[PDB]
Design a binder for these strands. Structure first.
Ligand SMILES: [Mg+2]
Ligand SMILES: [Zn+2]
Lengths: 38, 136, 94, 141
RNA sequence: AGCCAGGAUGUUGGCUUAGAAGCAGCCAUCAUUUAAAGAAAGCGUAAUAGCUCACUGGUCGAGUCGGCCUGCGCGGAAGAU
């Protein structure tokens, strides 16, 4: 989990999703890409 | 870093930075990085943004720096009391008012210039916007 | 072929003009030719969309004030310093 | 017909016999071994052409008797004798190195009668023309 | 947007390169069959092998896409009795 103030789609398979008031990036492809805003 | 080759005087009053800008239109290239905010650009910031743009376009097209840092900024050193003369000139700034076109660029496609200006904007302390050359 | 619908404005000056631009209009002026200049108010978004075209700055425009057509040319434009808006246009009678 | 079972497209000069070294490990890895082209490839090399590489299919079987059906040597090789030049690229556009006619390219095309699924003489003609204007010799018309 | 097929031929275009046929990298960036297929975008391969994509036909039967201008909000946001 990359906890960043700037969360971004790092590739085509990334998706922004808002869960419980937190902007997250979930990537089906690359688990490195998963991010949390914080 | 950019700085005047000579100045009449070494040191300037702080002054104020009121007002809107003058160099507001893209006048040399096709695209510009306009300043939405108000502040001062150091010579180091201007250079950092210039390196970012130039590297982004890969020595293609051409870049104009519409702002020149001509104002010397003094600082006092650490552990120095408040009086006893104005501080020494440490760096140079361009004052930037809203509307100032900071950089211009052409010879590139608009998407590439948008990317290059985004990188440069990330180097800079003021909010910017991408503008296009305007017919009149 | 650009047709611009305008209203003659009674209020003029900085307060009236800022009030116009707050109401999403903006002032303009028609001068040139033999008649007295005509201070008008323009709907900002329509004219902004129109002037997005280079023909707007090349062609003769038509401005309809009091249902009356005036053939003009956009001869000067004042823009917002940083916002994509228009402050003013000078129209010269074409 | 049958589904495409397994195949590799790697083939070398035909006239020289037992072309094992220039291919080597690619073909003798899954289904078809070494000494089964010093005759069969040669039993099909003679009746077509000697001394120029000829690509072929290798559709392998569990039954170890793979079917081969060959194609006429491509324009990848042929457009060397007719133009009289060996070199292709390197400086195709900086200063032209090769010269061919349209008629000789048309000739190289006609010899490839069934070499691909084409119904129009002019279609294959401009196909070979494109091949030539690609590699770097200007066709002369 | 899903789902069903394709996603090609000349071609391995090439030049190169310790190894690059689509990818250390440099050009041309053309033609054919085409309803549609890039001289190939990501991977991936020792270059090839290969997963896709760009693009098009069917099912689907109303919207759909992402830019700008703005209101309010969200994260960014850790301290000591
Ligand atoms: Mg006032
Ligand atoms: Zn991702």
């Amino acid at each position: 989990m990359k906890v960043r103030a700037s969360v971004k789609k790092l590739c085509r398979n990334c998706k922004i999703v808002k869960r419980d008031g937190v902007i997250r990036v979930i990537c089906s492809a690359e688990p490195k890409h998963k991010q949390r805003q914080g | 870093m950019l700085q005047p080759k000579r100045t009449k005087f070494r040191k300037m009053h702080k002054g104020r930075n009121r007002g809107l800008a003058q160099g507001t239109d893209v006048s040399f290239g096709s695209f510009g990085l306009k300043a939405v905010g108000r502040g001062r650009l150091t010579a180091r910031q201007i250079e950092a943004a210039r390196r970012a743009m130039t590297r982004a376009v890969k020595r293609q097209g051409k870049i104009w720096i519409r702002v020149f840092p001509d104002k010397p900024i003094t600082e006092k050193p650490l552990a120095v009391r408040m009086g006893k003369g104005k501080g020494n000139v440490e760096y140079w700034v361009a004052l930037i008012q809203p509307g100032k076109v900071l950089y211009e660029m052409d010879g590139v496609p608009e998407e590439l210039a948008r990317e290059a200006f985004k990188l440069a904007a990330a180097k800079l302390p003021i909010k910017t916007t991408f503008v296009t050359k305007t017919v009149m | 072929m650009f047709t611009i619908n305008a209203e003659v404005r009674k209020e003029q000056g900085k307060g009236a003009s800022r009030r116009l631009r707050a109401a999403n209009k903006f002032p303009a002026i028609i001068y040139g030719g033999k008649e007295a200049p005509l201070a008008i108010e323009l709907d900002h978004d329509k004219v902004m969309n129109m002037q997005a075209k280079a023909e707007f700055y090349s062609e003769v425009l038509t401005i309809v004030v009091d249902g009356k057509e005036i053939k003009v040319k956009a001869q000067d434009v004042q823009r917002h310093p940083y916002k994509p808006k228009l402050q003013h246009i000078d129209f010269v009678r074409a | 017909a049958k589904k495409v079972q397994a195949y590799v497209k790697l083939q070398v000069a035909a006239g020289m016999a037992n072309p094992s070294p220039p291919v080597g490990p690619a073909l003798g890895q899954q289904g078809v071994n070494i000494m089964e082209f010093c005759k069969a490839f040669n039993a099909k090399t003679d009746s077509i052409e000697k001394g120029l590489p000829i690509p072929v299919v290798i559709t392998v079987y569990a039954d170890r008797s793979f079917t081969f059906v060959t194609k006429t040597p491509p324009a990848a090789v042929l457009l060397k004798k007719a133009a009289g030049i060996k070199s292709g690229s390197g400086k195709p556009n900086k200063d032209k190195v090769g010269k061919i006619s349209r008629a000789q390219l048309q000739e190289i095309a006609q010899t490839k009668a069934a070499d691909m699924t084409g119904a129009d003489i002019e279609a294959m003609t401009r196909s070979i023309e494109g091949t030539a204007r690609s590699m770097g010799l200007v066709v002369e018309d």
